[PDB]
Design a protein around this ligand. Structure first.
Ligand SMILES: NC(=O)c1ccc[n+]([C@@H]2O[C@H](COP(=O)([O-])OP(=O)(O)OC[C@H]3O[C@@H](n4cnc5c(N)ncnc54)[C@H](OP(=O)(O)O)[C@@H]3O)[C@@H](O)[C@H]2O)c1
Ligand SMILES: Cc1cccc(Nc2ccccc2C(=O)O)c1C
Ligand code: NA
Length: 316
C-alpha cells in the first residue's frame, strides 16, 4: 500500500512522484538506473515528458521492474506530457502514441498539456527560423483539449490534465462549451519561496489537484534558471526545522506540500537521496511549523520559461 489521492475522474494519484528530468550534460543512461532505484525505494508515481528525451530509458526501467516481478503495472502511475509542437488537434494522438512506442507501454496514467504556448509542428522541439526566432504557432487550446479528451476515451491516457496553466487558461478549459473531462491536475512550480496559495485555492475550489515541480528549488540549470536566485534548500528556517526533526531541508519542503494538499514531485539521480525522499511519510509538521514555512513565501519563480514570452498564452 501507498498514499494516493482521488482525482476528479475517479482515478488515483500517488502523492509523491519521482521526477525524471536531468540537464543535457547528464547521460540518458542515468535515467534508467534512477527510475529503477526510485521504484525500489517506494516511489509509485513517475513523471516524464517527450521533451526530456528519456522516455526509452524510463520505459525500460518500468518494464524491467514489472517483468522481474518487483511491481505490477497497476501500481505504477506514469505521467507523460504533450509538447508544444503537437498542440494542433490532429497531432495530439500521434504524439501520445509516439511516446507510448518509445516507452513500450500500452497506456499512460496521465497525459498533460505541457505548456500553453504553441510552436510549429515538426521533429524539432524548439523550432527556430534562420534568424533564431522561435517559430510560434496559433492553436485553440480548447481544441487541443478535445483531442486530449479523445485520448482518454481511447484508453491511451487514463487521466488528462494541464501544466503551467494560469487562472485564465484554466477557466478557458473549465468554461468550454461541451467539456467532457476537467483537467485532473495543474502541474506548476511550487515550493516555499513560491507557494502558489492563490492558484492552489482556486484549483481546490474546482477539485483540481496542484502537482508541484521544482519543489526542492529546481535543478538550477542555466539558461533556464537565474544563478543569482536564492538556493531554496539553504533557507535558514527550512534548515532549522530539519535540524529539529533530524531530517533534511528537502524533506521539510516535501512534507510541507503534502500537508497542504499538494502532490509533490522530487527528482534525484543519487541512490542515497532517492531513498531519503520517501522518508517524507515518516514524520509530520505541526500547525506552527506549517505557518513558519508559509512565511517564507517570496514570489521567487525559478522557471520563468521566458524564451516563450510574447504570445498571448504565455502564462506568467
Ligand atoms: N511541468 C513542467 O513544466 C516541469 C518543469 C520542471 C520540472 N518538472 C518535473 O518536476 C521534476 C522535479 O523538478 P526539478 O527537476 O526542477 O527538480 P527538484 O525536484 O526541485 O530538485 C532536483 C534537485 O534537488 C536535488 N535533490 C533531490 N533530492 C535531494 C535531497 N534529498 N537533498 C538535497 N538535494 C536533493 C537533485 O540532485 P540529485 O539528482 O543529485 O539528488 C537536483 O539537483 C522534474 O524532474 C520533472 O519531472 C516539470
Ligand atoms: C531541452 C528542453 C526542450 C524543450 C522544453 C524543455 N523544458 C521545458 C520547457 C517548457 C516548460 C517545461 C519544461 C520542462 O522541463 O518541463 C527542455 C528542457
Ligand atoms: Na529534474
Amino acid at each position: 500500500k501507498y498514499q494516493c489521492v482521488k482525482l476528479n475522474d475517479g482515478h488515483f494519484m500517488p502523492v509523491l512522484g519521482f521526477g525524471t528530468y536531468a540537464p543535457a550534460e547528464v547521460p540518458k543512461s542515468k535515467a534508467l538506473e534512477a527510475v529503477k532505484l526510485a521504484i525500489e525505494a517506494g516511489f509509485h508515481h513517475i513523471d516524464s515528458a517527450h521533451v526530456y528525451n528519456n522516455e526509452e530509458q524510463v520505459g525500460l526501467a518500468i518494464r524491467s521492474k514489472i517483468a522481474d516481478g518487483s511491481v505490477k503495472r497497476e501500481d505504477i502511475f506514469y505521467t507523460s506530457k504533450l509538447w508544444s509542437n503537437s498542440h494542433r488537434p490532429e497531432l495530439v494522438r500521434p504524439a501520445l502514441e509516439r511516446s507510448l512506442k518509445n516507452l513500450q507501454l500500452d497506456y499512460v496514467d496521465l497525459y498533460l498539456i505541457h505548456f500553453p504556448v504553441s510552436v510549429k509542428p515538426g521533429e524539432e522541439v524548439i523550432p527556430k527560423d534562420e534568424n533564431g526566432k522561435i517559430l510560434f504557432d496559433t492553436v485553440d487550446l480548447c481544441a487541443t483539449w478535445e483531442a486530449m479528451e479523445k485520448c482518454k476515451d481511447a484508453g491511451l491516457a487514463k487521466s488528462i490534465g494541464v501544466s503551467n496553466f494560469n487562472h485564465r487558461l484554466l477557466e478557458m478549459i473549465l468554461n468550454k462549451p461541451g467539456l467532457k473531462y476537467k483537467p485532473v491536475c495543474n502541474q506548476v512550480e511550487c515550493h516555499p519561496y513560491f507557494n502558489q496559495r492563490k492558484l492552489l485555492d482556486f484549483c481546490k475550489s474546482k477539485d483540481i489537484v496542484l502537482v508541484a515541480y521544482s519543489a526542492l528549488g529546481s535543478h538550477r540549470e542555466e539558461p533556464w534558471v537565474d544563478p543569482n536566485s536564492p538556493v531554496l534548500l539553504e533557507d535558514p528556517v527550512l534548515c532549522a526545522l530539519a535540524k529539529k526533526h533530524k531530517r533534511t531541508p528537502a524533506l521539510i519542503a516535501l512534507r510541507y506540500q503534502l500537508q497542504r494538499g499538494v502532490v509533490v514531485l522530487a527528482k534525484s539521480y543519487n541512490e542515497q537521496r532517492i531513498r531519503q525522499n520517501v522518508q517524507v511519510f515518516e514524520f509530520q509538521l505541526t500547525s506552527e511549523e506549517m505557518k513558519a514555512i508559509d512565511g517564507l513565501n517570496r514570489n521567487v519563480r525559478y522557471l520563468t520559461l521566458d524564451i516563450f514570452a510574447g504570445p498571448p498564452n504565455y502564462p506568467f
